Scaffold this active site. Structure first.
Site, PDB file in Angstrom:
ATOM      1  N   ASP A 382       0.850  -0.829  -0.034  1.00  0.00           N
ATOM      2  CA  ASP A 382       0.148   0.459   0.265  1.00  0.00           C
ATOM      3  C   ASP A 382       1.397   1.361  -0.028  1.00  0.00           C
ATOM      4  OD1 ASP A 382      -2.451   1.634   0.375  1.00  0.00           O
ATOM      5  OD2 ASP A 382      -3.477   0.097   1.505  1.00  0.00           O
ATOM      6  N   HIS A 384      -0.377   4.346   0.274  1.00  0.00           N
ATOM      7  CA  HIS A 384      -0.956   5.553   0.610  1.00  0.00           C
ATOM      8  C   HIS A 384      -0.598   6.174   2.017  1.00  0.00           C
ATOM      9  CE1 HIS A 384      -4.970   5.324  -2.056  1.00  0.00           C
ATOM     10  NE2 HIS A 384      -4.826   3.960  -1.953  1.00  0.00           N
ATOM     11  N   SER A 435      -5.265  -4.135   1.653  1.00  0.00           N
ATOM     12  CA  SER A 435      -4.469  -3.493   3.045  1.00  0.00           C
ATOM     13  C   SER A 435      -5.205  -4.087   4.410  1.00  0.00           C
ATOM     14  CB  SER A 435      -4.288  -2.724   2.885  1.00  0.00           C
ATOM     15  OG  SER A 435      -3.131  -1.849   1.575  1.00  0.00           O
TER      16      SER A 435
HETATM   17  C1  B12 Z   1      -5.635  10.976  -4.052  1.00  0.00           C
HETATM   18  C2  B12 Z   1      -5.809   8.883  -3.887  1.00  0.00           C
HETATM   19  C3  B12 Z   1      -4.777   7.964  -4.134  1.00  0.00           C
HETATM   20  C4  B12 Z   1      -3.652   9.155  -4.799  1.00  0.00           C
HETATM   21  C5  B12 Z   1      -2.137   8.314  -3.812  1.00  0.00           C
HETATM   22  C6  B12 Z   1      -2.498   9.751  -2.359  1.00  0.00           C
HETATM   23  C7  B12 Z   1      -1.848   9.036  -1.234  1.00  0.00           C
HETATM   24  N1  B12 Z   1      -2.579   8.821  -0.255  1.00  0.00           N
HETATM   25  O1  B12 Z   1      -0.721   9.099  -1.049  1.00  0.00           O
HETATM   26  C8  B12 Z   1      -3.309   8.012  -5.830  1.00  0.00           C
HETATM   27  C9  B12 Z   1      -4.030   8.633  -7.228  1.00  0.00           C
HETATM   28  C10 B12 Z   1      -1.737   7.652  -6.496  1.00  0.00           C
HETATM   29  C11 B12 Z   1      -4.145   6.824  -5.810  1.00  0.00           C
HETATM   30  C12 B12 Z   1      -3.654   5.269  -5.703  1.00  0.00           C
HETATM   31  C13 B12 Z   1      -4.684   4.340  -5.616  1.00  0.00           C
HETATM   32  N2  B12 Z   1      -5.738   4.898  -5.408  1.00  0.00           N
HETATM   33 CO1  B12 Z   1      -6.827   5.450  -4.130  1.00  0.00          CO
HETATM   34  N3  B12 Z   1      -7.342   7.531  -2.872  1.00  0.00           N
HETATM   35  C14 B12 Z   1      -7.117   8.360  -3.126  1.00  0.00           C
HETATM   36  C15 B12 Z   1      -8.294   9.535  -2.419  1.00  0.00           C
HETATM   37  C16 B12 Z   1      -9.237  10.162  -3.398  1.00  0.00           C
HETATM   38  C17 B12 Z   1      -7.575  10.130  -0.767  1.00  0.00           C
HETATM   39  C18 B12 Z   1      -6.685   9.377  -0.785  1.00  0.00           C
HETATM   40  C19 B12 Z   1      -6.460  10.357   0.953  1.00  0.00           C
HETATM   41  O2  B12 Z   1      -5.022  11.800   0.182  1.00  0.00           O
HETATM   42  N4  B12 Z   1      -7.450  10.492   2.001  1.00  0.00           N
HETATM   43  C20 B12 Z   1      -7.169  11.867   2.738  1.00  0.00           C
HETATM   44  C21 B12 Z   1      -6.613  11.382   4.025  1.00  0.00           C
HETATM   45  C22 B12 Z   1      -6.585  12.588   5.162  1.00  0.00           C
HETATM   46  O3  B12 Z   1      -7.230   9.962   4.665  1.00  0.00           O
HETATM   47  P1  B12 Z   1      -7.088   8.650   4.542  1.00  0.00           P
HETATM   48  O4  B12 Z   1      -5.838   8.388   4.322  1.00  0.00           O
HETATM   49  O5  B12 Z   1      -8.344   7.867   4.815  1.00  0.00           O
HETATM   50  O6  B12 Z   1      -6.603   9.178   6.243  1.00  0.00           O
HETATM   51  C23 B12 Z   1      -7.217   9.419   7.253  1.00  0.00           C
HETATM   52  C24 B12 Z   1      -8.019   8.447   8.762  1.00  0.00           C
HETATM   53  O7  B12 Z   1      -8.571   7.096   7.744  1.00  0.00           O
HETATM   54  C25 B12 Z   1      -6.811   8.289   9.347  1.00  0.00           C
HETATM   55  N5  B12 Z   1      -5.701   7.348   8.967  1.00  0.00           N
HETATM   56  C26 B12 Z   1      -5.286   6.626   8.112  1.00  0.00           C
HETATM   57  N6  B12 Z   1      -4.384   5.419   8.220  1.00  0.00           N
HETATM   58  C27 B12 Z   1      -3.865   5.862   9.085  1.00  0.00           C
HETATM   59  C28 B12 Z   1      -3.584   5.098  10.175  1.00  0.00           C
HETATM   60  C29 B12 Z   1      -3.083   5.437  11.932  1.00  0.00           C
HETATM   61  C30 B12 Z   1      -2.044   4.719  13.141  1.00  0.00           C
HETATM   62  C31 B12 Z   1      -3.946   6.467  12.425  1.00  0.00           C
HETATM   63  C32 B12 Z   1      -4.397   6.327  14.031  1.00  0.00           C
HETATM   64  C33 B12 Z   1      -4.787   6.774  11.309  1.00  0.00           C
HETATM   65  C34 B12 Z   1      -4.772   6.344   9.997  1.00  0.00           C
HETATM   66  O8  B12 Z   1      -6.185   9.661   9.438  1.00  0.00           O
HETATM   67  C35 B12 Z   1      -6.461  10.221   8.139  1.00  0.00           C
HETATM   68  C36 B12 Z   1      -6.975  11.410   8.679  1.00  0.00           C
HETATM   69  O9  B12 Z   1      -8.686  10.934   8.993  1.00  0.00           O
HETATM   70  C37 B12 Z   1      -8.865   7.678  -1.306  1.00  0.00           C
HETATM   71  C38 B12 Z   1     -10.577   7.981  -1.348  1.00  0.00           C
HETATM   72  C39 B12 Z   1     -10.584   8.065  -0.376  1.00  0.00           C
HETATM   73  N7  B12 Z   1     -10.189   7.920   0.910  1.00  0.00           N
HETATM   74  O10 B12 Z   1     -11.692   7.310   0.231  1.00  0.00           O
HETATM   75  C40 B12 Z   1      -8.257   6.727  -2.719  1.00  0.00           C
HETATM   76  C41 B12 Z   1      -8.856   5.650  -2.309  1.00  0.00           C
HETATM   77  C42 B12 Z   1      -7.817   5.278  -1.378  1.00  0.00           C
HETATM   78  N8  B12 Z   1      -8.353   4.674  -3.899  1.00  0.00           N
HETATM   79  C43 B12 Z   1      -8.396   3.643  -4.228  1.00  0.00           C
HETATM   80  C44 B12 Z   1      -7.500   2.957  -4.836  1.00  0.00           C
HETATM   81  C45 B12 Z   1      -8.527   1.584  -5.615  1.00  0.00           C
HETATM   82  C46 B12 Z   1      -6.372   3.080  -5.641  1.00  0.00           C
HETATM   83  C47 B12 Z   1      -5.144   2.547  -7.090  1.00  0.00           C
HETATM   84  C48 B12 Z   1      -5.099   1.038  -7.010  1.00  0.00           C
HETATM   85  C49 B12 Z   1      -6.288   3.177  -8.588  1.00  0.00           C
HETATM   86  C50 B12 Z   1      -7.116   2.725  -9.050  1.00  0.00           C
HETATM   87  N9  B12 Z   1      -7.793   1.543  -9.489  1.00  0.00           N
HETATM   88  O11 B12 Z   1      -8.423   3.481  -7.971  1.00  0.00           O
HETATM   89  C51 B12 Z   1      -4.338   3.362  -6.399  1.00  0.00           C
HETATM   90  C52 B12 Z   1      -3.634   2.263  -4.994  1.00  0.00           C
HETATM   91  C53 B12 Z   1      -2.113   1.450  -5.615  1.00  0.00           C
HETATM   92  C54 B12 Z   1      -1.225   1.170  -4.647  1.00  0.00           C
HETATM   93  N10 B12 Z   1      -1.417  -0.386  -4.936  1.00  0.00           N
HETATM   94  O12 B12 Z   1      -0.740   1.084  -3.336  1.00  0.00           O
HETATM   95  C55 B12 Z   1      -9.224   2.905  -3.307  1.00  0.00           C
HETATM   96  C56 B12 Z   1      -9.125   1.861  -2.419  1.00  0.00           C
HETATM   97  C57 B12 Z   1     -10.122   0.967  -2.195  1.00  0.00           C
HETATM   98  C58 B12 Z   1     -10.182  -0.048  -2.777  1.00  0.00           C
HETATM   99  N11 B12 Z   1      -9.807  -1.728  -2.418  1.00  0.00           N
HETATM  100  O13 B12 Z   1     -10.182  -0.239  -4.688  1.00  0.00           O
HETATM  101  C59 B12 Z   1      -9.904   4.443  -3.073  1.00  0.00           C
HETATM  102  C60 B12 Z   1     -10.895   4.293  -1.772  1.00  0.00           C
HETATM  103  C61 B12 Z   1     -11.316   5.111  -3.749  1.00  0.00           C
HETATM  104  C62 B12 Z   1     -11.968   3.694  -4.462  1.00  0.00           C
HETATM  105  N12 B12 Z   1     -12.690   3.260  -5.706  1.00  0.00           N
HETATM  106  O14 B12 Z   1     -13.445   4.234  -3.995  1.00  0.00           O
HETATM  107  N13 B12 Z   1      -4.777   7.045  -4.953  1.00  0.00           N
END
Ligand code: B12
Ligand SMILES: [Cl-]
Ligand SMILES: [Zn+2]
Length: 496
Positions: A382, A384, A435
């Site tokens: 992963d 992300h 993941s």
């Molecule tokens: C922009 C983004 C990307 C960027 C990467 C940005 C990054 N994170 O580096 C790019 C375009 C490169 C990317 C790639 C992909 N993505 Co993407 N991505 C996103 C998106 C739109 C937002 C991510 C982001 O920055 N969120 C903002 C942050 C601040 O929030 P967060 O990470 O969820 O974290 C919060 C909480 O979860 C928590 N948290 C998270 N981790 C942890 C850990 C701890 C210890 C704690 C306390 C808290 C915590 O704290 C944060 C603040 O509240 C999400 C949409 C979403 N979240 O629904 C999809 C999403 C996660 N992506 C997804 C997918 C599938 C992909 C790809 C395969 C491409 C594709 N075919 O869609 C690849 C993955 C590559 C790989 N093998 O790793 C899916 C995952 C679901 C799935 N199983 O299919 C999502 C949901 C999109 C969807 N299809 O609905 N992605």
């Protein structure tokens, strides 16, 4: 117009589709599909991936019905190529496979590309490779040129059948890392249009604006979609509904959106803050702040994120004989907690939260000099990094020491760093569905090695229910739905 691709048939993404899939509601699904087509979609993004479900079973049921019943082509959005293989058999006509990356080497890349070649499908190609995500213009071009050479020559695919996803990162959280990532995609797209004529470009345009109020998202997505079109964009994965024409965007909101997309900073001008200023007066509220009594004014520094003359207010406190512990655990913590309250309620947006943290960084810097440890990593396979980095910043600026292992970290490397730093907890992030499996696996191993340490799993894709299922394996697991639940859980597990 561009080849629009509808984003609502997404189990993780769309709440409606999620429910309807779980309830096996074919006619509801088909309604949401036709709705998107009506709103302008030329094809549809199917993702039925979700924690604790067999993707292949859901696909075996839904795909045959969609094949007879849909006007537009389907884009299969699966990390699993097995799913992809199945779908190409249960869906004749035009197809598009979504992903094909080099994150985990040539096995899965060549698998998906030879599938596409065999079944005359189009291919989306994400600019992720063996060293990670292509974040700069140079990186995007390097990766892209490699993939092009490989698909066109090794697999024999025609340029016309390839859509390059040069990656859309959100630019709508404060972090200075993210400021130019939209620009960098844009300038790369232009370069690759020249270098690689013939090829499509696709973007997940909605991502640029993630973590903003829907008013500001619609605008920023629209302006970004447009800038992309003018640089070579052929297709776009969007909500056909949540897209304004540029005409229906006021000239001020337009110019601000552009300033944010191209990171047009100057002394006293923060694009992101200015763009957020719109959608939520000017001279009036300024004066109101200076009027506050210092007890609440120091609390409003943390809440509003005012580091403009903060060193001056922080002396007036110590000139009343107020102890530096009393200011840290009283007004400045009250402010921070309130930002936590406001964000957890869903009222405050992230950028103000980060300035909140930066004010508590500058406040502790002035008061204390002249708490615990967390080993944080994103799990194997992963990439992300953003969610974890946010957790890093929040805990870092509230006194916790965070060991950030980066991304794609295997359990052995984590426990190596656990053994070295003896932390009060392990944090594991991961946003993909697969993941969640890697987290299950890791807990199984830690149970084998006889660990009892608190493990916080904060990956978005995490039903509390499954987390309860994971308690059967490892008893001390916690789900953090957001980064603040992280800070709360670190306070409970150290005694604060
Ligand atoms: C922009 C983004 C990307 C960027 C990467 C940005 C990054 N994170 O580096 C790019 C375009 C490169 C990317 C790639 C992909 N993505 Co993407 N991505 C996103 C998106 C739109 C937002 C991510 C982001 O920055 N969120 C903002 C942050 C601040 O929030 P967060 O990470 O969820 O974290 C919060 C909480 O979860 C928590 N948290 C998270 N981790 C942890 C850990 C701890 C210890 C704690 C306390 C808290 C915590 O704290 C944060 C603040 O509240 C999400 C949409 C979403 N979240 O629904 C999809 C999403 C996660 N992506 C997804 C997918 C599938 C992909 C790809 C395969 C491409 C594709 N075919 O869609 C690849 C993955 C590559 C790989 N093998 O790793 C899916 C995952 C679901 C799935 N199983 O299919 C999502 C949901 C999109 C969807 N299809 O609905 N992605
Ligand atoms: Cl490089
Ligand atoms: Zn091959």
């Amino acid at each position: 117009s561009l080849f629009l691709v509808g984003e609502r048939l997404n189990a993780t993404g769309s709440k409606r589709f999620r429910e309807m899939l779980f309830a096996r509601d074919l006619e509801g699904i088909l309604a949401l599909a036709r709705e998107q087509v009506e709103e302008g979609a030329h094809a549809l993004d199917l993702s039925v991936a979700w924690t604790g479900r067999d993707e292949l079973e859901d696909l075996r049921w839904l795909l045959p019905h969609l094949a007879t019943a849909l006007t537009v082509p389907v884009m299969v959005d699966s990390t699993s190529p097995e799913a992809m293989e199945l779908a190409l058999k249960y869906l004749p006509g035009r197809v598009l496979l979504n992903s094909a990356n080099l994150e985990d080497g040539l096995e899965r890349f060549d698998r998906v590309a030879s599938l596409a070649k065999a079944h005359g499908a189009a291919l989306v190609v994400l600019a992720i490779d063996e060293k990670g995500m292509a974040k700069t213009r140079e990186e995007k071009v390097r990766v892209a040129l490699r993939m092009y050479e490989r698909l066109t020559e090794h697999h024999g695919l025609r340029p016309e059948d390839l859509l390059f996803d040069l990656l859309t990162f959100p630019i709508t959280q404060g972090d200075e890392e993210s400021r130019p990532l939209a620009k960098e995609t844009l300038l790369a797209m232009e370069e690759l249009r020249e270098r690689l004529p013939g090829v499509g470009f696709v973007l997940g345009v909605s991502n640029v604006s993630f973590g903003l109020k829907p008013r500001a998202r619609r605008v920023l997505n629209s302006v970004f979609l447009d800038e992309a079109r003018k640089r070579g964009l052929t297709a776009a994965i969007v909500d056909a509904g949540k897209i304004l024409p540029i005409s229906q965007i006021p000239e001020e909101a337009y110019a601000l959106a552009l300033d944010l997309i191209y990171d047009r900073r100057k002394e006293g001008f923060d694009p992101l803050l200015a763009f957020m200023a719109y959608f939520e007066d000017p001279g009036k509220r300024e004066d109101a702040f200076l009027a506050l009594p210092l007890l609440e004014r120091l609390k409003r520094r943390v809440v509003e994120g005012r580091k403009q003359g903060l060193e001056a207010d922080l002396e007036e406190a110590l000139k009343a004989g107020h102890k530096p512990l009393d200011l840290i655990n009283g007004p400045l913590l009250a402010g921070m907690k309130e930002v936590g309250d406001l964000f957890g309620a869903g009222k405050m947006q992230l950028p103000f939260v980060l300035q909140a943290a930066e004010v508590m960084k500058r406040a502790v810097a002035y008061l204390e000099p002249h708490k615990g440890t967390l080993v944080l990593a994103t799990v194997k396979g992963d990439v992300h990094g953003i969610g974890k980095n946010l957790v890093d910043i929040i805990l870092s600026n509230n006194g916790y020491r965070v060991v950030n292992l980066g991304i794609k970290v295997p359990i052995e490397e984590i426990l190596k760093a656990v053994e070295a730093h003896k932390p009060h907890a392990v944090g594991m992030s991961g946003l993909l569905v697969k993941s969640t499996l890697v987290m299950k696996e890791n807990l199984e191993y830690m149970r084998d090695r006889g660990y009892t340490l608190p493990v916080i799993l904060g990956g978005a894709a995490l039903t509390r229910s499954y987390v309860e299922e994971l308690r059967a394996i490892y008893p001390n697991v916690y789900y953090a739905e957001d980064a603040f639940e992280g800070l709360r859980l670190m306070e409970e597990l150290t005694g604060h």
